[PDB]
């Protein structure tokens, strides 16, 4: 499995604040935390969606 569309929960390990190299982890995230992450991601998605159609309509970035 795991192709296109399916959501994967991850926690940020190593960040390179110079050029751009990001490390992520799935197993470190607890069973209780996964749901929280999903909720946050859902909320984030909604926010993005909110600022997508509106952006399109008035014709601004």
């Amino acid at each position: 499995l795991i192709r296109v569309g399916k959501n994967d929960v991850a926690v940020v390990l190593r960040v390179d604040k110079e050029k751009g190299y990001i490390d992520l982890s799935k197993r470190r995230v607890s069973s209780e935390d996964i749901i929280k992450c999903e909720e946050k991601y859902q909320k984030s998605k909604t926010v993005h969606s909110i600022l997508r159609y509106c952006a399109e309509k008035f014709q601004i970035p």
Binding site: L13, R14, D16, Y21, I22, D23, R27
Partner: protein, 302 residues
């Protein structure tokens, strides 16, 4: 820093080193400079380097395989879920150690797995491999009575070299023509192989003429064998009798252009089928019947 430079460094000596072992070591060295703690700045870069190496290749196959093996090892390494330091240290360590292990493997091959030529069974060998020669030399050492048979190598005159390497021991040998291969199957016992890589399908990635030899062996029912330092399983599938990832053209059809020129491009790499391995000498113990495939499965978890 370059792996290419490292590769260049070793040329005239070697004979003792084993394919990926040196390459693997080089890779390890490359790794232990630019912070091996992180994974984003590292694995990707390693992959890029490997790609570059592949691009740069004149005529070499097993490098890719070696790289894949290294990758697998790396993957195996980080599963302990403790701390980043210890694992990193272990990774750093495992290169020289790997090289050392190769020698041990070779030794094992030369002392335990050498009971195929003992009762003066005349050996049909073509294709210069180091492992084969080690086996020969250590057979001579043990005094385990033997005779050698080699078909003449004439695309670039390696035959002469082979003959010379056989004079060191001090034992009579003979020249064989690869068209008169049907002429002599009478006193020579079995056909043994020194090659370039081991196939995913089961057969062997070898030099100038092999399929014919295989056919002849089949006709004669004198079993076909492969002698190798066992970590040259290249990620390549020969799906047909004449289709492979090759260093050069496949039977290059040349035009009548100049005077005595476009013909010397001999097909110096060829293949034979999977139903030929009666035994293959492997350093993980003598295991063959469907061993390579099993190994592959273990690697790709499928």
């Amino acid at each position: 820093f370059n792996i290419t430079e490292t590769y260049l460094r070793f040329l005239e000596e070697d004979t003792e080193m084993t394919m990926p072992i040196a390459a693997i070591e080089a890779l390890v060295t490359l790794l232990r400079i630019k912070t091996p703690e992180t994974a984003a700045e590292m694995i990707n870069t390693i992959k890029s380097s490997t790609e570059e190496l592949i691009k740069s290749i004149p005529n070499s196959v097993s490098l890719r395989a070696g790289c894949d093996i290294f990758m697998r090892f790396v993957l195996r390494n980080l599963h302990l879920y403790g701390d980043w330091e210890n694992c990193k240290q272990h990774l750093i360590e495992n290169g020289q150690l790997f090289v050392s292990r190769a020698k041990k493997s070779r030794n094992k091959i030369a002392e335990i797995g050498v009971d195929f030529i003992a009762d003066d069974d005349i050996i049909l060998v073509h294709g210069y491999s180091r492992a084969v020669f080690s086996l020969l030399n250590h057979a001579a050492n043990k005094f385990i009575r033997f005779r050698c048979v080699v078909t003449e190598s004439r695309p670039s005159k390696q035959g002469n070299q082979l003959y010379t390497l056989l004079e060191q021991k001090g034992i009579p040998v003979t020249l064989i023509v690869d068209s008169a291969v049907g002429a002599v199957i009478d006193k020579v016992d079995k056909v043994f192989v020194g090659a370039e890589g081991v196939a995913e399908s089961g057969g062997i990635i070898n030099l100038v003429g092999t399929y014919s030899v295989g056919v002849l062996a089949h006709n004669a029912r004198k079993p076909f064998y492969v002698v190798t330092e066992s970590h040259k399983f290249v990620r390549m599938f020969p799906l047909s009798s004449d289709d492979l990832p090759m260093a050069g053209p496949p039977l290059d059809f040349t035009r009548r252009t100049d005077d005595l020129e476009d013909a010397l491009r001999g097909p110096t790499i060829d293949y034979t089928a999977q139903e030929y391995i009666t035994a293959l000498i492997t350093d993980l113990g003598v295991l063959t019947p469907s061993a390579v495939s099993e190994e592959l499965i273990k690697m790709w978890y499928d």
